[PDB]
């Protein structure tokens with residue numbers, strides 16, 4: 001509260017560390033469904049069903065231009081990629097399995113880097 005500060009966690013390297021994690025996810029062999037925005041004109045259902053599309057290239061642009069206020073907003077967008085993937089794809093499909101694999105991959109890098 002006013003004039004009562006909790007001790008300050010060091011956040012000076014967050015930007016660099018999120019960029020590294022993003023690079024590792026970009027180069028994972030199962031990243032291909034998530035590298036670019038889904039083509040809303042060519043994929044039936046997607047525009048109407050998925051209220052907030054997100055993909056790795058859009059995350060990269062936002063990180064490179066100061067559009068994440070902090071750590072957690074970056075993590076919310078990464079998770080959104082995988083939450084959208086589960087909404088639109090069967091668990092037993094290549095894309096569905098790619099999604100589950102990439103989420104598991106991210107969450108371990110996230111824990112090891114920050115927790």
Ligand SMILES: CC(=O)N1CCN(c2ccc(O)cc2)CC1
Pocket residue numbers: 033034038039042043084085088089095
């Ligand atoms: C990431 C994701 O959920 N998808 C769903 C469907 N997909 C697709 C693309 C082209 C096409 O002709 C038919 C399906 C794009 C990726």
